[PDB]
Curated annotation (Swiss-Prot), chain A:
Spans annotated as Demethylase activity: 130-666
Residues found modified as N6-acetyllysine: 262-263, 266
SWIRM domain segment(s): 4-103
Disulfide bonds: none
Cross-link type Glycyl lysine isopeptide (Lys-Gly) (interchain with G-Cter in SUMO2), residue numbers: 272, 299
Gene, per the UniProt record: KDM1A
Gene Ontology molecular function: any one: p53 binding
Protein's name according to its UniProt entry: Lysine-specific histone demethylase 1A
UniProtKB/Swiss-Prot annotation, chain B:
Family from the record: Belongs to the CoREST family.
Reported tissue expression: Ubiquitously expressed.
Quaternary structure note: Interacts directly with GFI1 and GFI1B in a RCOR/GFI/KDM1A/HDAC complex. Interacts with INMS1. Component of a BHC histone deacetylase complex that contains HDAC1, HDAC2, HMG20B/BRAF35, KDM1A, RCOR1/CoREST and PHF21A/BHC80. The BHC complex may also contain ZMYM2, ZNF217, ZMYM3, GSE1 and GTF2I. Interacts with REST. Interacts with the SMARCE1/BAF57, suggesting that the BHC complex may recruit the ATP-dependent chromatin-remodeling SWI-SNF complex. Interacts with SOX2. (Microbial infection) Interacts with herpes virus HSV-1 ICP0 protein; the interaction leads to the disruption of the BHC complex, thereby preventing the BHC complex from repressing transcription of viral genes.
Source species, domain of life: Eukaryota
Gene name of this polypeptide: RCOR1
Domain SANT as annotated: residue spans: 71-122
Compartment(s) where it occurs, according to its Swiss-Prot or TrEMBL record: Nucleus
Region (Interaction with KDM1A): 1-74
Domain free text: The SANT domains may bridge the nucleosomal substrates and the demethylase KDM1A.
Species annotation: Homo sapiens (Human)
Coiled-coil segments on the chain, per record: 24-59
Protein name as annotated: REST corepressor 1
Amino acid sequence: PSGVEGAAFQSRLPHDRMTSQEAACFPDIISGPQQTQKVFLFIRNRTLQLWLDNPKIQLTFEATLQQLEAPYNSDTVLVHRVHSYLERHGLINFGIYKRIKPLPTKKTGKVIIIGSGVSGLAAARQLQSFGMDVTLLEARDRVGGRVATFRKGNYVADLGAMVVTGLGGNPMAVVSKQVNMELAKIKQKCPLYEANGQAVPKEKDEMVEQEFNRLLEATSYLSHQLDFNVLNNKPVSLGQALEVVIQLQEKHVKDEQIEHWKKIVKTQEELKELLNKMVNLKEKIKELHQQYKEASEVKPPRDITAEFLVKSKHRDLTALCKEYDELAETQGKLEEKLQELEANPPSDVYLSSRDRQILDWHFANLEFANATPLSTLSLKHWDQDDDFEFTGSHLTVRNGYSCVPVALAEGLDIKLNTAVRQVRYTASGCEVIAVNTRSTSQTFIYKCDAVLCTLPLGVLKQQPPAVQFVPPLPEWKTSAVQRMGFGNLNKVVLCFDRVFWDPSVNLFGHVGSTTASRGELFLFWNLYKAPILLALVAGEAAGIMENISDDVIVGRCLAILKGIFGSSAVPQPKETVVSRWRADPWARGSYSYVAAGSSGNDYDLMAQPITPGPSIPGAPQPIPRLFFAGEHTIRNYPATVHGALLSGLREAGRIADQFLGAMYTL
Amino acid sequence: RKPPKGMFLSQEDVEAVSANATAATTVLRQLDMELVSVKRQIQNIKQTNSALKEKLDGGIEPYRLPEVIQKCNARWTTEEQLLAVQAIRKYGRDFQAISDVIGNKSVVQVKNFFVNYRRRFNIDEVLQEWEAE
């Protein structure tokens, strides 16, 4: 898209109608005449454009109004309202801009932010620019959270997020202009190599992939048009539904063979019945010939009955000889109809044991995409975010994704090596209790108006609790934490001193011997300047490989690479790193997934802030005190870095509206 | 609205594979066993029809008679009349067979012949006698 209409698209907003969010801030506009609605929408879309076309400087309200043409710049208060809504909710003036108007000398309100991952950092940075006192508590010795970059010498490799999924409507696009990210595209081409070490031939690769895509499309049919979403009082997973769909294909192949050979027997029997007339007729002909000979033997002159007998038997014999010919026409019509059907039998198998291995690799992709075995994904809901995907190529970050959190951390109060241990929220405020990760006896108490929790879903899931809430989180929240899925996905970084792979290929697959090991080192990434290959561990393999030492793992990696490239082209690696994210106590997994029995509605439950009970009974109902952000809290963009970031922007707007007031609603 | 082409997915089949834990591998096994049943029933009727074919070697070539190319005629010689009455006695009303016996009479004057000699040759009685057999 293009123009002001393109700014709305790049801000994930409809250009020609008003969202639920802005109906709430502008209930006068939306309930009023469409002429003002179109004015409003134009003011919104234009202001977004201004910010988007240059996001390295703050977009002040005045700069906005100066560049607004009439009649749109007539209502000066509407323009100030729109600009203030966009600024508050992080649609403009978010990230790392130079600020025209420097910060107010003295702050208002005090917020404690648990975690300095991207969601935390994005909120912290907004809150501070709104005039609040913000402190982040971070368990690790570095910022970024699940954005984690390895750096040694000139080796650089991401252990966490690696790709930016498109810039069409993606908030990272704005960040990539503010921070120096070396964004390099990913060429979709992915050569596969079976366990032996030899490339899967192109004819196979296209057919299995298209079956994979058809199998998926087929489960959607089971889900929607057949409503196959509960089986034995339990929710159906994607994985179950795939087995059901594969079985029914195997079944139809047998159904198809049975009726084919049943057409063979139906006509072999029709032949048998024909050959039976022909034996019996050729015996009748044999006898009747004999009788014609004997009758013919009586020599003339004959009386007329003896003459009749010759003429008679002759008529009778040619009649029977005519039947036996009509029945050898028919015998040929069928001896061909048979050899025809023998010539064209149907498919012998649905998929060979070689095919279902290559199909298993395409399932390892899907298991990688959702960081979980397909047996845990909700059949109905696992792809509920597909409608909000961004447009464009997927990219990687050549200088390491960490440049982004590190950049956002500039100018913020971050206490590292500070493990939050307990969160107390009351009608009058909050106190957060943390310890030092190096010596746990050293204890800290932080007092604040509000806590913004960005603890990973895996941490919130931990029993017994790594973090205690006082009072406990309500059942509606903890149940959402149970129902949701927090998956797992690991990486092996292989640092060589020579590039020996095809450098025109960003990524290539390895097909697994077994179904159960389909995720074990199934995919390799060539993303970086230096000679670094990156190897994925997905599905059920991920959780298993964490209990295997690094040397065994890098070993299995070397064997696979030698199989493809030859035992002589693959040197020992200089440096090796193996992630274990489920083992990491500040992650306990990689990212969330729509578990069977869950839905995207749970992502909304996770984002709902907590309001404590009154300290004095009969006192008026209080303000909300505990807020939640993070990738597990944003329904339309879960499990991504852009999704985390957006959730931080969201809570910062929500918290500011609470503690500073929203003056844009009159 | 419909399953992708070449996918087969009917509601009745899905219940049949979801009924228990192994309802998949039984339903498949029954068809696998039912197929080998049919494959060897082929081997059997194909073996039977191999024997029947052996019996027909030679066909009926030795038992064939030369075709009597013979111009028609409309004059009923006495012998031909007597052939006719006997053909009526053994063939009922099958005018093609009767014309084929006499040879030089076509199917129509055979038809005509029954009315022409109906009384003189008791052609009624001859058919009544033929009816009894």
